[PDB]
């Protein structure tokens, strides 16, 4: 059940920017410009996810401090899957990150827990790191099933026997995505504590304290500092605000003072 | 109707293998009587566009129904155009049956893509069980009726008939089977749209097309080209492009 003890600050912070279906050469140029000019908050792993057609472009222009990730991928390296990309391609492009299980993939494009778990297992085997997304819908939280949803989504990869060194868990309540309805620091902290409790029992105390757990869902330059006060929130997954200069303010808010 | 040959690389490719394909394609001379389009995986679209001779156009393997928005993992016609491309494959069997894209979603994608000013290779095809049950005509017509219902125009649409049972199995449709379906498709277009559209719309065949059968399939008058998967990854793809030469 939902643990109570707060974690110590023993994990490297993480701030990811998911551009979603946004971007063209000109706008990507603009983003890369403010990202490169930003201070190199070495205390924070910074990752951005451009749409597939702009992955190589972004990597060629970004400073070493900003890593590039794919927004999704499939479960085999090569094959007859029109419209899909694989970890092999991600590696070929010189990238080492991928976002899997994003709310939009699960609820707009119907990706199942099983599929997402298979993708995760394969991506990890390939040597790429994964930002594993989980989260409940408003009706589910109101029915008191926040824990049940997150448990199932996480158990899906535990059952596949994945290792956790290269996994960053992103808790993103569906109701907070692009709605401005940000979870309160308290609400987020309690879910993150529960997630660590889950990891402690399902895996090990070591994994629980080493695994980064970031919050996503209407994170803005104005609430980042406030949310970052919670020891169990190791960073954020940013959507809309990752397309603007405010993304830098969010990174600065998370970095060591 | 000018011959149309498309190469769908599907989820295949890295810089090295893409370079190999670009090499044999660039080595070939252009054929005035054949339009050639290849569809690289999304991460290599720009790379392929910069490396390929002007005679070969690049197409995206899929896209969504809005120009921009919160749809992680999706690309749009706006991006396709920004990349300098003018083609997209929609409704491919793998999207419909492996990733569950509905007839309605595909029709909406098609409407949006055409509105954006890009051309569409609209894919349709029945499964083995549907053909055995006598619904080849029904299934293919239903998939087409979906865009007819949306009121799309057809000047920028190439129809790709690819029976599911013939994809990557080596179980190629015979020339007679394909010709029969393409004739039905034109009848559908002549009735639902117009005689002009029925005669102008290019209908290409896909499903285990190889250098061994392309020449023979190409002799059927209602087949206006091919959509090639596995065979598009090797040099003999050029023999398919020149199927009517």
Main-chain phi, psi angles of B4, to 5 degrees: -130, 125
Q: Are B71 and A21 in contact (CB under 8 A)?
A: yes
Full 3-state SS string of A161-189: CCCCCCEEEEECCHHHCCCCCCCCHHHHH
Active site residue: B112, B162, B176, B191, which one? B162
The β-bridge partners of B60 are B88
A180 touches chain B (CB under 8 A): no
Selected residues 35-54 of chain A with any CB under 8 Å from a CB in chain B: 49, 51-54
Measure A238 CA to nearest chain B CA, in Å: 12
A89: three-class secondary structure by DSSP:
helix
Method: X-ray
Contacts of A21 in chain B (CB under 8 A): 64, 66, 68-72, 74-76, 79
A57 touches chain B (CB under 8 A): yes
With tokens 């749009």, the residue in question is B76
CATH code for the domain of A228: 3.20.20.70
CA distances from A112 to A108, A126, A176, A232, B22 (A): 11, 21, 21, 28, 36
Contacts of A84 in chain B (CB under 8 A): 10-11, 41
Concerning whether A190 is annotated as a catalytic residue, the answer is no
B169 touches chain A (CB under 8 A): no
With tokens 């023993």, the residue in question is A10
Within chain A, how many helices (H) and strands (E) appear?
A: 11, 8
A102 touches chain B (CB under 8 A): yes
Question: How many residues make up chain A in this entry?
Answer: 257
Max alpha carbon distance in chain A (Å)?
Answer: 49
**A210 CB neighbour count, 10 Å cutoff:** 14
Measure A103 CA to nearest chain B CA, in Å: 9
- The pair of structure tokens assigned to B142 is 């239903």
Active site residue: B92, B112, B126, B130, which one? B92
Dihedral of alpha carbons A71, A75, A81, A85, sign? positive
Cα A83–chain centre separation: 22
Cα B204–chain centre separation: 7
Report which of A175, A187, A180, A185 is spatially closest to residue A240, judged by C-alpha positions.
Answer: A180
Resolution of the entry in angstroms: 1.7
Q: Are B147 and B110 in contact (CB under 8 A)?
A: yes
CB burial class (10 A; 0-12, 13-18, 19+) of residue B16? exposed
CA distance A131 to A70: 10
- The pair of structure tokens assigned to B169 is 């199995």
CA distances from A219 to A46, A184, A214, A216 (A): 15, 11, 11, 6
The β-bridge partners of B37 are B6, B57
Report which of A167, A87, A147 is spatially closest to residue A119, judged by C-alpha positions.
Answer: A87
Cα A100–chain centre separation: 8
Q: Which domain holds residue A212?
A: 1-257
- The pair of structure tokens assigned to B138 is 């029904």
CA distances from A59 to A64, A141, B214 (A): 9, 38, 41
- The pair of structure tokens assigned to B223 is 């087949």
**A110 CB neighbour count, 10 Å cutoff:** 11
Cα B59–chain centre separation: 10
CA distance B115 to B103: 18
Main-chain phi, psi angles of B39, to 5 degrees: -120, 95
CA distance A126 to A209: 25
Selected residues 103-142 of chain A with any CB under 8 Å from a CB in chain B: 103-105, 108-110
CA distance A236 to A247: 11
CA distances from B30 to A174, B7, B34, B90, B150 (A): 51, 15, 8, 26, 36
Is B10–A79 a contact, with Cβ atoms under 8 angstroms apart?
yes
Main-chain phi, psi angles of A134, to 5 degrees: -140, 160
A32: three-class secondary structure by DSSP:
helix
Is A57–B43 a contact, with Cβ atoms under 8 angstroms apart?
no
With tokens 């619904």, the residue in question is B135
DSSP A117-168: HHHHHHHHHTT-EEEEEE---HHHHHTT-HHHHHHHHHHHHHTTT--STTEE
Contacts of A56 in chain B (CB under 8 A): 43, 46-47
The H-or-E segment that residue A67 falls in is strand A66-70
Report which of A235, A232, A236 is spatially closest to residue A200, judged by C-alpha positions.
Answer: A232
Q: Radius of gyration of chain A from Cα atoms?
A: 17
Concerning whether A102 is annotated as a catalytic residue, the answer is yes
Pairs across A and B, CB distance < 8 A: 128
CB burial class (10 A; 0-12, 13-18, 19+) of residue A99? buried
Measure B131 CA to nearest chain A CA, in Å: 22
Full 3-state SS string of chain B: CCEEEEEECCECCCHHHHHHHHHHHHHCCCCCCEEEEEECCHHHHHHHHHHCCCCEEEEECCCCCCCCECCCCCCCHHHHHHCCCCEEEECCHHHHHCCCCCHHHHHHHHHHHHHCCCEEEEEECCCHHHHHCCCHHHHHHHHHHHHHHCCCCCCCEEEEECCHHHCCCCCCCCHHHHHHHHHHHHHHHHHHCCHHHHHHCCEEEECCCCCCCHHHHCCCCCCCEEEECHHHHCCCHHHHHCCCC
Q: Residue A18, annotated ligand binder?
A: yes
CA distance A194 to A150: 9
Active site residue: A136, A172, A190, A193, which one? A172
Q: Are A242 and A30 in contact (CB under 8 A)?
A: no
Cα angle, residue A246 at apex, residues A240 and A251 outer, rounded to 5°: 100
CA distance B245 to B236: 14
Q: Are B79 and B71 in contact (CB under 8 A)?
A: no
Q: Which residue of A has its CA nearest to B88?
A: A83
Domain count of the fold of chain B = 1
Is A72–B76 a contact, with Cβ atoms under 8 angstroms apart?
no
B70 touches chain A (CB under 8 A): yes
The partner residue sitting opposite B73, judged by closest CB among A55, A72, A89, is A72
Measure A90 CA to nearest chain B CA, in Å: 9
């Amino acid at each position: 059940s939902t643990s109570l003890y707060k974690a110590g600050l023993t994990r490297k912070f993480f701030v990811g920017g998911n551009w979603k279906m946004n971007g063209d050469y000109a706008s990507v140029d603009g983003i890369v410009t403010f990202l490169n000019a930003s201070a190199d908050n070495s205390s924070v792993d910074v990752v951005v996810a451009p749409p597939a057609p702009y992955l190589a472009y972004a990597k060629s222009k970004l400073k070493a401090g900003v890593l590039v990730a794919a927004q999704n991928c499939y479960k085999v390296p090569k094959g007859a899957f029109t419209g899909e990309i694989s970890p092999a391609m991600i590696k070929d492009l010189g990238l080492e990150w991928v976002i899997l299980g994003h709310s939009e993939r699960r609820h707009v494009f119907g990706e199942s827990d099983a599929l997402i778990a298979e993708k995760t297992v394969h991506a990890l085997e390939a040597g790429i790191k994964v930002v594993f997304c989980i989260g409940e819908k408003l009706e589910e939280r109101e029915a008191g099933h926040t824990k049940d949803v997150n448990f199932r989504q996480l158990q899906a990869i535990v059952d596949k026997g994945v290792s956790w060194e290269n996994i960053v868990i992103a808790y993103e309540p569906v109701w907070a995505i692009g709605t401005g309805k940000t979870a309160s620091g308290e609400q987020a902290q309690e879910v993150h504590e529960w997630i660590r409790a889950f990891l402690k029992e399902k895996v090990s105390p070591a994994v629980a304290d080493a695994t980064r757990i970031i919050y996503g869902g209407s994170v803005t330059a104005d609430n980042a500092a406030e949310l970052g006060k919670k020891p169990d929130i190791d960073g954020f997954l940013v959507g809309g605000a990752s397309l603007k200069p405010d993304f830098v303010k969010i990174i600065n808010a998370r970095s060591t003072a």
